[PDB]
Nucleic acid binder design. Structure first.
Ligand SMILES: Nc1ccn([C@H]2C[C@H](O)[C@@H](COP(=O)(O)OP(=O)(O)OP(=O)(O)O)O2)c(=O)n1
Ligand SMILES: [Ca+2]
Ligand SMILES: [Ca+2]
Length: 342
DNA sequence: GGCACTGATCGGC
DNA sequence: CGGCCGATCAGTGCC
């Protein structure tokens, strides 16, 4: 297998730079304004100039503004980013035997047959891909080329920004022998340190432990994954991804535990959700509340039949009542998630 | 036991 | 201090 992984650089901010090139080369922060105050919200992403000043995705807008007050702060325009994404994925698709769109800004291509199993031709294809995306959309991307998805991602991550990372079939074992634990996709900061605390600093160190031992430290899924990766026995296929849930969640103007105050927000979320569902009919509904202290509480139900929009309204209220019954905290955000489509 | 399914949390992008 | 989403996993019912 020859895999090409593509990950768009500083995606949302970069699109904003394409639409407003005056922003380029200066700190730019794309913000998710919740509307509760002039500046309440979180950072979706920042360009590299803003990152140099300490701005990070997920950080409160007010905190970004504290450390980089002269950056340009713009509101997230997600539909435009989706459009860019859709066009790019369409360009990628024509170069691939198979494509896996993993998120709004990354995809895996299986180009094995496209390049006659010739790994070097795979690299050339990767260069052509980067060139085309740059020419056609003025977007820089980072690419990784490797025998499997996971190494393709790791080497891309190591080559950002605007990179072209490569791991040849012959380099894989050396590469896996030297890889740091915190460089592994799917191993978050906390767990990394926990493993680190137990003397697991490098991927190869996993081989020292056995499954029952590691499960206690990582959980089943993460244990099986790590033991496989460490042995270069990861080889998962490129698969067409299918949307499994669709939802909407909004910040209320003020916190509340007043049913009549919350309902309008919840019903708008349902309405916008059903618009997005289009012809998909969900059998499961979950109501999700972000509480005063930014904890998240969910109550849901699966039905033996598809849920009409009208049944979603009435059942959502019963779920909201359940949350209010079982959690005394005030609610800040309220929303809904639909899944199990017919 | 272990399969099928569930509701709820977790955490990455 | 946003707004999403898929993965994960412990609990139940069952044969
Ligand atoms: N907490 C986050 C993280 C990311 N995103 C969105 C904005 C990002 O641009 C996009 C892609 O996420 P990445 O992790 O790939 O990061 P970037 O593309 O922004 O930067 P990088 O160049 O490091 O890949 O997802 C978001 O809305 N909220
Ligand atoms: Ca990405
Ligand atoms: Ca990216």
């Amino acid at each position: 297998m020859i895999v090409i992984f593509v990950d768009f650089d500083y995606f949302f901010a970069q699109v904003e730079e394409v639409l407003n090139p005056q922003y380029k080369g200066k700190p730019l922060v794309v913000c998710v304004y919740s509307g509760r105050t002039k500046t309440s919200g979180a950072v979706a992403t920042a360009n590299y100039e803003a990152r140099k000043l300490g701005v990070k995705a997920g950080m409160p807008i007010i905190k970004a503004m504290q450390i980089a007050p002269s950056a340009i702060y713009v509101p997230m325009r997600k539909p435009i980013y989706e459009a860019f994404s859709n066009r790019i994925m369409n360009l990628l698709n024509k170069h691939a035997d198979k494509i896996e769109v993993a998120s709004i800004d990354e995809a895996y291509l299986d180009v094995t047959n496209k390049v006659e199993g010739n790994f070097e031709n795979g690299i050339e294809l990767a260069r052509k891909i980067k060139q085309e995306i740059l020419e056609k959309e003025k977007i820089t991307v980072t690419v990784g080329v490797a025998p499997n998805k996971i190494l393709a991602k790791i080497i891309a991550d190591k080559s950002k920004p605007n990179g072209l990372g490569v791991i040849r079939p012959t380099e894989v074992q050396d590469f896996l022998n030297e890889l740091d634990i915190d460089e592994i996709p799917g191993i978050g900061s906390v767990l990394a340190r926990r493993l680190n605390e137990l003397g697991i600093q490098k991927l190869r160190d996993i081989l020292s432990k056995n499954y029952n031992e590691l499960e206690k430290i990582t959980g089943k899924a993460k244990a099986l994954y790590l033991l496989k990766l460490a042995q270069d026995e990861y080889n998962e296929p490129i698969r067409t991804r299918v949307r499994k849930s669709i939802g909407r969640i909004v910040t209320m103007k003020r916190n509340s535990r007043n049913l009549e105050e919350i309902k309008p927000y919840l019903f708008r979320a349902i309405e916008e959700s059903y618009y997005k569902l289009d012809k998909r009919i969900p059998k499961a509904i979950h109501v999700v509340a972000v509480t005063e202290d930014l904890d998240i509480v969910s109550r849901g139900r699966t039905f033996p039949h598809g849920i009409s929009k009208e049944t979603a309204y009435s059942e959502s209220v019963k779920l909201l009542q359940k949350i209010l019954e079982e959690d005394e905290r005030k609610i800040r955000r309220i929303g809904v998630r639909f899944s199990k489509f017919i």
